[PDB]
């Protein structure tokens, strides 16, 4: 996991908010594969 971070492995995310107003919520239809 240290070396994963070091190669650019990212955080898991389920939904997102937008940076640009108006703030909007956006969700993945399903969970990203566990092995990431």
């Amino acid at each position: 996991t240290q070396q994963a971070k070091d190669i650019g492995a990212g955080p898991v995310a389920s939904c997102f908010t937008t940076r640009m107003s108006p703030p909007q919520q956006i969700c993945l239809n399903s969970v990203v594969n566990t092995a990431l």
Binding site: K5, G10, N29, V32, N33
Partner: protein, 297 residues
């Protein structure tokens, strides 16, 4: 030096400021972990990612739900409302009301669109996904996976029967990637002025010394059948942030003088500061598109 501003776009350390082959130039905190993020300020023309021993193209969405890992690529999975892929038109519509973004060129718009998504754990809004713009279909593809290279039995597995194991992959330029442009969150909106794009016909990169443009005094010669293959080689040897000890800050073998007659890609790793008029040469960089040439005119 009358060359100073013309040559400003070629000072890749300054105008790009990050890895090119692998760009992981910044860190973004999310719940106390510093994730590595692409951060280069220039578009990387023609770069894509190759998944080794695989038919999976990297713009395929990441595996979600019941899919195998090795069946998905790198791109955002489907969302509601659907954020990726998004065509140029869709983006112009979606961002029509935004003063800063609405009228951006397609590449910067694609970068700002990818950088619009805050992951739900990212209380501080640090994390911005990179993107790939495909200018044939005119579609922006947000990349869920920011990683660009992973090799060695340690961290990936090439076995096509183990479909939930991590795939190996590497960045590349390839004729099939000609229409792809790889975009960090930091792509500047004036990249057209301050970043390389076109290969310079009838020109050889040089160094300005005491009133004269001198040849690059030491280069690393690779044979190459054409300009495309030279650009590919320069890309392979260019600034890389792949394992702030691991950051290149844009330092590397980023420039090439391609001699079309001897078919030599003359590759070097210091910023050039002038041009020499030589009908045998085309001046390329790892950032430049591997096809487009600017007329000697």
């Amino acid at each position: 030096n009358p060359w100073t501003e013309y040559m400003a776009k070629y000072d890749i350390e300054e105008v790009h400021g990050s890895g090119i082959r692998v760009d992981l130039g910044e860190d973004a905190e999310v719940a106390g972990t510093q994730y590595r993020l692409p951060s280069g300020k220039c578009p990387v023309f023609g770069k894509g990612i190759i998944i080794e021993n695989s038919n999976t193209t990297f713009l395929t969405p990441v595996a979600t739900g019941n899919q195998y890992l090795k069946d998905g690529g790198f791109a955002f999975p489907p969302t509601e409302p659907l954020m990726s892929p998004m065509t140029l038109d869709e983006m112009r519509h979606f961002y029509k009301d935004n003063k800063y973004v609405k009228n951006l060129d397609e590449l910067t718009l694609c970068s700002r669109h990818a950088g619009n998504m805050i992951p739900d754990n990212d209380k501080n809004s640090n994390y911005k996904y990179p993107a790939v713009y495909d200018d044939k279909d005119k579609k922006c593809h947000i990349l869920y996976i920011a990683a660009q290279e992973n090799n060695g039995p340690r961290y990936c597995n090439k076995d096509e029967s183990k479909r939930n194991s991590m795939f190996c992959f590497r960045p590349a330029k390839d004729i099939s990637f000609q229409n792809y442009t790889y975009l960090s969150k930091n792509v500047v909106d004036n990249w057209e002025k301050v970043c390389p794009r076109k290969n310079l016909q009838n020109a050889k990169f040089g160094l300005w010394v005491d009133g004269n443009c001198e040849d690059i005094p030491h280069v690393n010669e690779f044979p190459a059948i054409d300009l495309f293959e030279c650009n590919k080689l320069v890309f392979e040897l260019s600034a890389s942030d792949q394992p702030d000890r691991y950051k290149s800050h844009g330092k590397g073998y980023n420039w090439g003088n391609y001699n079309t007659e001897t078919q030599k890609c003359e590759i070097f790793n210091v910023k050039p500061t002038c041009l020499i008029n030589n009908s045998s040469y085309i001046a390329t960089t790892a950032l430049s598109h591997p096809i487009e040439v600017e007329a000697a005119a």
